Amino acid sequence: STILGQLCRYYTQWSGSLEVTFMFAGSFMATGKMLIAYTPPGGNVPADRITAMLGTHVIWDFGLQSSVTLVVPWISNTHYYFDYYTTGIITIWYQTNYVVPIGAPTTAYIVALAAAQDNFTMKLCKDT
Amino acid sequence: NLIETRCVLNHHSTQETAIGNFFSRAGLVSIITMPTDGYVNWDIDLMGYAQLRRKCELFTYMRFDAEFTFVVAKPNGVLVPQLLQYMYVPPGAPKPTSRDSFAWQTATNPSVFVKMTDPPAQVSVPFMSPASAYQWFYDGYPNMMGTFSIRTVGTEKSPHSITLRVYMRIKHVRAWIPRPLRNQPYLFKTNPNYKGNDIKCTSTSRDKITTL
Amino acid sequence: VAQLTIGNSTITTQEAANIVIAYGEWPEYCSVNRFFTLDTKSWAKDSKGWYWKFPDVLTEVGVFGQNAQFHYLYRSGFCVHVQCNASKFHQGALLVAVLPEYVLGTIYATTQPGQVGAVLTHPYVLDAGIPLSQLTVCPHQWINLRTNNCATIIVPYMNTVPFDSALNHCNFGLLVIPVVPLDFNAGATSEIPITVTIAPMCAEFAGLR
Amino acid sequence: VAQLTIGNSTITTQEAANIVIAYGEWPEYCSVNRFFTLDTKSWAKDSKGWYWKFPDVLTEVGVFGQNAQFHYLYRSGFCVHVQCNASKFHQGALLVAVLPEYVLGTIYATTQPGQVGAVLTHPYVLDAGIPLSQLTVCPHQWINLRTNNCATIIVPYMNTVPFDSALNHCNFGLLVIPVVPLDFNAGATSEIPITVTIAPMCAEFAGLR
């Protein structure tokens, strides 16, 4: 659904860094914490929050900041069918529960945004 | 009991609350009776009495010397011409097991030879810990200062009853890391166990919050 | 609202110049330095208190957990950060204090609770025979849900020896006690979370693996 | 909170240096300049979106409406201001974006809706076959009811010719789409208003009456 994932269908190989932006869209009176963990490629997905904390993670509390940015350091593809693909895994963990007073809604939503960095390039134009 | 009169107006000197003057005087730590085995072993303990246990547990680390005095007499006042020996066994040295053990003539255990008709003996013991301070509270899993062994000198038993009391002064005191004061009755001398069935409130009560 | 970053760990904490340094001394010397964020405890209406033992809380967590299990000697300071997440319609007051050589008493799993921590059964006597009213002679900090939601204490190394083993001796304990109990009206969030964040400062190891 | 005044029209808008200029270009040249405040739209729980076509929105309003109907050629930039009025107990998120040459598609009154504007039937495909997920490649701005209640975009003149007729060609379209739907508890105000304010910048007319 991104414009980055549609322009990569017009090429064969690409390499660079990304950045993923989250955005909380709940009421002003609500507060809590989330853990945005990132696993490097080749590693395994975390089983619980205590092992996801030991990797690369941010602690995004939405009672203070309405938006956070996580940077994936490097991705790479060489397409051939099969592709030689080194990608990580992003996981969102409940650090605390969702704290809400009376009158404010109990369910909120997060929007995820994604883009490329200044060192992202691609080559070998290809028809889709 | 409350009298409105006689307010004092001048401030006092701060030297009454110095850490040396809080422990400056000598108090009784043990009463040793030897009626007619023939020897007593008393290893040095400060937490034996409820007083000075609550006063040393105000801090976490303490570092001091000691000075012992041995007031010795009969069970009622009397003093007879009797020769006595007070052997100090350092930490890590064996204690005497009987009246004629070989540890009584061990040269590295220093002894004091007094008579009962003398003034009391006085002995200064230095800081004997391998650490840099004593600690009354150790959270981990495994403060010895020594042992005093007391007997009457001779190869046969003496026809006298010996009763001595030990007085100890604490010198060159340094204290670290203050701590809340104990408000529950003590149970054992080693651990800070309290009786959890009944808890004594720190303050005594009143009827209403407005009735002063 | 700043955004602290040490190592590969990032927390977002507001810039507040009301830290407390334990006894006015900074932790100094004679990849383990990052932000370790513990599991979160739920403050309820009938909760009593919690405690964590140091450095027993980080003996099985991360590269600090494996450096303790292999090396023989150990020495570090700490930077503890306790924060709360509640609305403007909740009320209560916590007391966050450290206590060196905090020895518990029976009325082991209770003495060494680990990463989770244990709960106080009799918080009036701190489960050690000493009253809660004089706990503020220790390095402490108040969390009052009316005004602030954050507390941070800088703890140096306190021991009689310059280096010690990390697997038996516990240097201090961190106590979080609800002096004024939590209250709200019906329909609000019934359990308020409390998050503890630890960062070692000037950690040294001297014994071989 | 400032108080802007252009012409005989006064709005009270807080001073906020987070305007967005479309493609980094300011509207320049090759009594119509005032604040036109449109009718207010009600955001409900099941609303889908709205759109306005420019300069079709001001063809029957004011002296800009009669200058378009009499003169032959036309060229202007715009300064669109979309703001929302909600409490601290409401939640939702709007996406306010402009889109040059926004051509709709059948699955005219719908293509030229006027001052009121029309509503989107399928907002996932923007009623044109293009996804909503990539609408942010256009000059856009987020209205998140948690943080801000205001959005302003400065749009220059975008055409292949320096002057154009104002009565058939519509230069761009302003799209306001609730990506995250509105939510509240029962007893709060059920419909939240959305107000659009337009001000022409550097307007020129070259054709005689």
Residue type, C79: C
Contacts of C142 (CB under 8 A, 6+ apart): C93, C94, C95, C96, C151
Token pair recorded at residue C32: 């383990």
For residue C82, the SS3 value is: strand
Q: Are strands C36-37 and C192-204 parallel, antiparallel or unpaired?
A: antiparallel
Contacts of B102 (CB under 8 A, 6+ apart): none
Q: What DSSP string describes A60-113?
A: EETTT-SEEEEEEEEEEEEE---EEEE--EEEEEESS--B--TTS-S---EEEE
Q: Are strands A33-39 and A56-61 parallel, antiparallel or unpaired?
A: antiparallel
C9: β partners: A57, C6
At CA C115, angle to CA C114 and CA C121, rounded to 5?
Answer: 65
Chain C interface disruption, residue of B136, B179, B197, most C CBs within 10 A: B179
The reply to whether omega before A46 is within 30° of 0 (cis) is no
**C169 and B179 in contact by Cβ < 8 A?**
no
Is B17 exposed, middle or buried (CB count within 10 Å of its CB: 0-12, 13-18, 19+)? exposed
Residue type, B93: A
| Interatomic CA distance for residues C117 and C106, integer angstroms | 17
| Interatomic CA distance for residues C147 and C149, integer angstroms | 7
Q: Cβ contacts (< 8 Å) between A50 and chain C: which residues?
A: 39, 61, 115
**B139 and C158 in contact by Cβ < 8 A?**
no
| Interatomic CA distance for residues A120 and A71, integer angstroms | 13
Min Cα–Cα distance to chain C from A79, Å: 31
Contacts of C160 (CB under 8 A, 6+ apart): B61, B131, B132, B133, B135
**C61 and A50 in contact by Cβ < 8 A?**
yes
B63: β partners: B174
For residue C70, the SS3 value is: helix
Token pair recorded at residue B186: 């003590």
Helix/strand/coil percent split, chain B, to 5: 5, 35, 60
Residue type, B173: V
Min Cα–Cα distance to chain D from A6, Å: 10
Own/partner contacts of D52-55, CB < 8 Å, gap of 24 or more, are D52/D113, D52/D117, D52/D173, D52/D174, D52/D196, D53/D102, D53/D111, D53/D112, D53/D113, D53/D170, D53/D172, D53/D173, D54/D78, D54/D155, D54/D170, D54/D171, D54/D172, D54/D173, D54/D174, D55/D166, D55/D170, D55/D171
Chain A residue with the nearest C-alpha to that of D188: A103
The sign of the CA dihedral B203, C46, C128, C72 is: negative
- Compute the radius of gyration of chain C from its Cα atoms: 17
The domain spanning residue C98 has which CATH number?
Answer: 2.60.120.20
Residue type, C41: K
Name the residue among A6, A29, A109 with its Cβ closest to that of D180: A109
Name the residue among C99, C102, C122 with its Cβ closest to that of B199: C122
Is D105 exposed, middle or buried (CB count within 10 Å of its CB: 0-12, 13-18, 19+)? exposed
Q: Cβ contacts (< 8 Å) between A22 and chain D: which residues?
A: none
Residue A5 contacts C where some CB pair is shorter than 8 Å: no
Min Cα–Cα distance to chain D from A87, Å: 23
Q: Report which DSSP code applies to A40.
A: P
Residues constituting chain C: 209
Residues constituting chain D: 209
* Chain C contact residues (CB < 8 Å to A): 1, 3, 8-12, 14, 35-37, 39-40, 42, 61-62, 85-90, 115, 185, 187-189, 191-193, 195, 197
At CA D204, angle to CA D203 and CA D208, rounded to 5?
Answer: 140
| Interatomic CA distance for residues D8 and D6, integer angstroms | 6
Is A1 exposed, middle or buried (CB count within 10 Å of its CB: 0-12, 13-18, 19+)? exposed
Residue A12 contacts C where some CB pair is shorter than 8 Å: no
* Contact assessment for residue D96 and residue D176, using Cβ atoms and an 8 Å cutoff: yes
Query: Cα A28 from chain centroid?
Result: 24
| Interatomic CA distance for residues A15 and C57, integer angstroms | 41
D167: β partners: none
The residue among D73, D72, D71, D68 whose CA lies nearest residue D36 is: D68
**Among all chains, which residue has been given the structure tokens 């076509």?**
D53
Domain that holds residue C40: 1-209
| Overall CATH class of domain B1-212 | mainly beta
For residue C207, the SS3 value is: coil
**Among all chains, which residue has been given the structure tokens 């209406």?**
C45
Q: Which chains touch D (3 or more CB pairs under 8 A)?
A: A
The residue among D199, D32, D196 whose CA lies nearest residue D113 is: D196
Q: Cβ contacts (< 8 Å) between D143 and chain A: which residues?
A: none
Q: What is the resolution of this structure in A?
A: 3.1
C141: β partners: C96
Chain breaks in chain D (C to N over 2.5 A) after: 30, 107
The residue among D136, D110, D135 whose CA lies nearest residue D124 is: D135
| Interatomic CA distance for residues C151 and C196, integer angstroms | 10
* Contact assessment for residue B62 and residue B140, using Cβ atoms and an 8 Å cutoff: no
| Interatomic CA distance for residues D187 and D152, integer angstroms | 31
Question: Could you give phi then psi for residue B179, rounded to 5 degrees?
Answer: -155, 150
Q: Cβ contacts (< 8 Å) between B137 and chain C: which residues?
A: 101, 103
* Contact assessment for residue D201 and residue D7, using Cβ atoms and an 8 Å cutoff: no
Task: Tell me how many domains chain D contains.
Answer: 1
| Interatomic CA distance for residues B114 and D44, integer angstroms | 103
Contacts of B96 (CB under 8 A, 6+ apart): B39, B41, B87, B89, B103, B104, B149, B151
Question: Could you give phi then psi for residue D24, rounded to 5 degrees?
Answer: 70, 15
Q: Are strands C4-6 and B83-89 parallel, antiparallel or unpaired?
A: unpaired
Residue type, D124: Y
* Contact assessment for residue C196 and residue B167, using Cβ atoms and an 8 Å cutoff: no
A84: β partners: A78
**C125 and B193 in contact by Cβ < 8 A?**
no
Kindly provide the residue ranges of all beta strands, DSSP E only, lying in chain D, ordered along the sequence.
4-6, 9-11, 20-21, 36-37, 41-43, 50-54, 75-84, 91-100, 118-119, 140-144, 150-155, 172-183, 192-204
Question: Could you give phi then psi for residue D192, rounded to 5 degrees?
Answer: -100, 135
The residue among C107, C110, C90, C101 whose CA lies nearest residue C194 is: C90
Token pair recorded at residue B131: 């650490």
The residue among B78, B92, B70, B91 whose CA lies nearest residue B151 is: B70
Token pair recorded at residue B86: 């007070």
**Among all chains, which residue has been given the structure tokens 């601290």?**
D88
| Interatomic CA distance for residues C53 and C66, integer angstroms | 18
Q: Report which DSSP code applies to D26.
A: -
The residue among B75, B70, B73 whose CA lies nearest residue B87 is: B70
Q: Cβ contacts (< 8 Å) between D89 and chain A: which residues?
A: 27-29, 103-104
Chain B residue with the nearest C-alpha to that of C104: B192
Residue C110 contacts B where some CB pair is shorter than 8 Å: no
For residue D70, the SS3 value is: helix
